[PDB]
Design a protein around this ligand. Structure first.
Ligand code: VJS
Ligand code: VJS
Lengths: 227, 226
């Protein structure tokens, strides 16, 4: 197969979706075939659709989903409120494996944070990464409190020997304050920061978003993701 | 000795200080001698002295601390901005051990979340809990995202065999709402929910805060702490 990369975050609303679109756009511009997967999507009644947003920002047409739940809550609670059930652990893995192909970068965007239950009992994106032997890209913020959450997430990855592909700051302000600048330097000592997307990147058009994506990441790292 | 409880949280601004005061007030009314220790404190330029708030809200007099930084940043960052290093690991452990005495409940409030550096090099409240053989009370919120942060914190505690004394919701909204009501049920499935302090409890006068605290916690669990 190719390269599978789960994209998680320190929590919800930290920029998982825009980072998936940014990395997808950068990989596409490098000639890499890209598929984006969102196996569990909640909040569809509120209009949330991360796959649709990734295709809007990065032009990705190879988009794969599985479970969709109306309420903007945890998958376990959103499924319970709709009378539905969570998908099986093997259903999520099968969805990802069918996308895997040589020369392709497959991004698997989680729901919420790393330890969110995606399947019963207590199956998380961390367990999924072990099943498909994928490294983990962790989206973080630059705000107060990000250092604790980033350390907690990377320690959880190491507990199951899930490699950390690095960090991405979901929103980087201009200009940065004392806290944001201090956080970015401290985050760089925790792990390698692959990119810091400028604030409001999700509001850019396709042209501006592609230029931002190509400049946000190191092309040597993006090209090295897929052989 | 007595009972040492470190009081951490899933992050910053989750209610660690008001929970320390609430548990201190409930334990005092149960006849338990209470000491509160905030070894490292930041953001004092804004005027936040967490020990002073604990003394005003719960009436605790044994209030111990080692360092106060004015900048509202992480202890390591605020220390670097002021050009002054953090306390030593032995300073924090020995201060807490000297506070501990039979019949006393000693609460150790951390700065920020569990894995925040409180002493060089990279010493956290989790390391301190191991040295003083203390269990951990985890302050959580009721908002969206608390489930992942709580699970991450509890896993970090278990990774160092630090026992979890339960959870406390730092601010219970009114009206709760769908997410908050669902989170409270899910949090109880993860760990024991010792209390959920009502929103705005940090602004109560000393008398009103004492009445809230006595009703927020189970009187039998508080009495069994020492
Ligand atoms: O996780 C991170 O990014 C690192 C980090 C570490 C510590 C804090 C704090 O300590 C806050 C800062 C301002 C006041 C402090 C607050 C209080 O004293 O009321 C608390 O204890 O949480 C915030 C962030
Ligand atoms: O940790 C917790 O308390 C549990 C938890 C679990 C999942 C979510 C989500 O999935 C959010 C809900 C609404 C939109 C979702 C968002 C997106 O779809 O873009 C995301 O994935 O973060 C939020 C909280």
């Amino acid at each position: 197969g190719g390269t599978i990369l789960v994209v998680t975050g320190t929590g919800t609303g930290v920029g998982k979706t825009v980072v998936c679109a940014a990395l997808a756009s950068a990989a596409r511009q490098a000639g890499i075939d890209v598929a984006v997967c969102k196996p569990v999507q909640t909040g569809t009644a509120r209009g949330d659709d991360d796959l649709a947003e990734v295709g809007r920002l990065a032009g990705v047409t190879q988009l794969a989903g599985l479970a969709r739940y109306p309420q903007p809550m945890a998958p376990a609670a959103a499924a319970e409120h709709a009378g539905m059930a969570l998908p099986a652990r093997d259903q999520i893995v099968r969805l990802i494996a069918d996308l895997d192909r040589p020369g392709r970068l497959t991004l698997v965007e989680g729901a919420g944070g790393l330890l969110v239950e995606l399947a019963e009992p207590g199956v998380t994106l961390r367990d999924v990464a072990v099943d498909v032997a994928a490294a983990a890209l962790v989206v973080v913020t630059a705000d107060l409190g990000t250092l604790n959450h980033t350390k907690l997430t990377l320690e959880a990855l190491a507990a199951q020997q899930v490699s950390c592909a690095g960090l991405v700051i979901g929103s980087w302000p201009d200009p940065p304050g004392l806290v944001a600048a201090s956080n970015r330097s401290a985050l760089a000592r925790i792990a390698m920061v692959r990119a810091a997307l400028p604030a409001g990147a999700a509001s850019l058009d396709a042209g501006d978003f592609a230029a931002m994506s190509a400049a946000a990441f190191d092309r040597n790292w993006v090209a090295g993701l897929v052989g």
